[PDB]
Amino acid sequence: DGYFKIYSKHTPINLGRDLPQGFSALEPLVDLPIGINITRFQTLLALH
Amino acid sequence: NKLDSKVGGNYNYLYRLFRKSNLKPFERDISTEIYQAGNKPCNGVAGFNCYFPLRSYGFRPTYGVGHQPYRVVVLSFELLHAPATVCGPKKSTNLVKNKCVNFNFNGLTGTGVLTESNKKFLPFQQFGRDIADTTDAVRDPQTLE
Amino acid sequence: QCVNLITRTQSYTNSFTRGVYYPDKVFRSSVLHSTQ
Amino acid sequence: IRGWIFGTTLDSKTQSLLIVNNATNVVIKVCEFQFCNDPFLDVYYHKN
Ligand SMILES: *[C@@H]1O[C@H](CO)[C@@H](O[C@@H]2O[C@H](CO)[C@@H](O[C@H]3O[C@H](CO)[C@@H](O)[C@H](O)[C@@H]3O)[C@H](O)[C@H]2NC(C)=O)[C@H](O)[C@H]1NC(C)=O
Ligand SMILES: *[C@@H]1O[C@H](CO)[C@@H](O[C@@H]2O[C@H](CO)[C@@H](O[C@H]3O[C@H](CO)[C@@H](O)[C@H](O)[C@@H]3O)[C@H](O)[C@H]2NC(C)=O)[C@H](O)[C@H]1NC(C)=O
Ligand SMILES: *[C@@H]1O[C@H](CO)[C@@H](O)[C@H](O)[C@H]1NC(C)=O
Incomplete structure (x- = not known):
């Protein structure tokens, strides 16, 4: 509905493997109405 | 028209x-790209029966009534579900506990006794609900318990 | 400064139970809740 | 890894969403950005 919703979590994990079996839900953290179409996306890396 | 209409038009x-x-x-x-209202690819600034968005109204004071400028604002909002931040000029009372009262929390009116809960609401939550879909706990908007 | 640099390669993985989130901002406890 | 672009066209023909994080606070903006085919962040020791 033109509203961009962000949910997130972090969890400590022992070195079996990433995305482990178990459970944890994401809490809502940010919300903002952009009022626009979205079709594509990318991510910012930080080089030293 | 008293403040947005002009004799030169607007x-x-x-x-x-x-x-x-x-x-x-x-x-x-707000994109200004040409629209293919003709059956064939109108490209660049012009083409056969093809257009940008439409020319504006002749907002001239003499045009006549129902046909001049009308400033509109539409207030779109939601309520009674979530941590509120904008409302009416209604005063808070003191808070009383263990006694039967007609409460109102952020417009959630009801009748009940208010008691110290043992419930760990997460910070984003204003109301707590039951199996009958009715509010059985609330976070006070003045002191956060 | 319109530099290209990102060398991105990928593989595939099973997202077992991940990406569940609180569906609305109402407290609920000791209940099973059906949500779409 | 710090932030994201979300959009329909990413080339200033229409508005698009940018999220950027750093060491403290985040900035969000929706704009007719002309992104670079590789959007990324540099942070470095500026001698001045
Ligand atoms: C949100 O942005 C999307 C990307 O701009 C847009 O999708 C695009 O929609 C048009 C019209 O349907 C497509 O144009 C093509 O449509 C068919 C082929 O699918 C042909 O008959 C046409 O000649 C033309 O080539 C785009 O290809 C399509 N792009 C994608 C990636 O799907 C959405 O329509 C936008 N939605 C809103 C609400 O703005
Ligand atoms: C993370 O990056 C943020 C920008 O993406 C940055 O925010 C910027 O912080 C500076 C310093 O507080 C602000 O600079 C302004 O400060 C006052 C305003 O009255 C003036 O004296 C300055 O001339 C200047 O206008 C920026 O405005 C602000 N940018 C935004 C978008 O708010 C954070 O500070 C960065 N965080 C860290 C830890 O470095
Ligand atoms: C009432 O408003 C004042 C002034 O902003 C503030 O100091 C006070 O903490 C508020 N009351 C409560 C219970 O927080």
Whole structure:
């Protein structure tokens, strides 16, 4: 509905493997109405 | 018209007659690309029966009534579900506990006794609900318990 | 400064139970809640 | 890894969403950005 919703979590994990079996839900953290179409996306890396 | 209409007209009030489909709710498009209202690919600034968004209204004071400028504001909002931040000029009372009262929390009116809970609400939560879908706990908006 | 640099390669993985989130901002406890 | 672009066209023909994080606070903006085919962040020791 033109509203961009962000949910997130972090969890400590022992070195079996990433995305482990178990459970944890994401809490809502940010919300903002952009009022626009979205079709594509990318991510910012930080080089030293 | 008393403040947005002009005897020279006021052609800065643009409106869009053309879009490839109907847009969804609360969405504004400001792109100026040519629209193919002719059956063949109109490219660049012009083409046969092809257009940008439509020319603005002749907002001239003499035009006549129901046909001049009308300033509109639409207040869209939601309520009674979530941590509120904008409301009416109603005063808070003191808070009383263990006694039967007609409460109101952020417009959630009801009748009950108010008690110290043992419930760990997460910070984003204003109301706590039951199996009958009715509010059985609330976070006080003045002191956060 | 419109530099290209990102060398991105990918593989595939099973997202077992991940990406569940609180569906609305109402407290609930000791209940099973059906949500779409 | 710090932030994201979300959009329909990413080339200033229409508005698009940018999220950027750093060491403290985040900035969000929706704009007719002309992104670079590789959007990324540099942070470095500025001698001045
Ligand atoms: C949100 O942005 C999307 C990308 O701009 C847009 O999708 C695009 O929609 C048009 C019209 O349907 C497509 O144009 C093509 O449509 C068919 C082929 O699918 C042909 O008959 C046409 O000649 C033309 O080539 C785009 O290809 C399509 N792009 C994608 C990636 O799907 C949405 O319509 C936009 N929605 C809103 C509400 O703005
Ligand atoms: C993370 O990056 C943020 C920008 O993406 C940055 O925010 C910027 O912080 C500076 C310093 O507080 C602000 O600079 C302004 O400060 C006052 C305003 O009155 C003036 O003296 C300055 O001339 C200047 O206008 C920026 O405005 C602010 N940018 C935004 C978008 O708010 C954070 O500070 C960065 N965080 C860290 C830890 O470095
Ligand atoms: C009432 O408003 C004042 C002034 O902003 C503030 O100091 C006070 O903490 C508020 N009351 C409560 C219970 O927080």
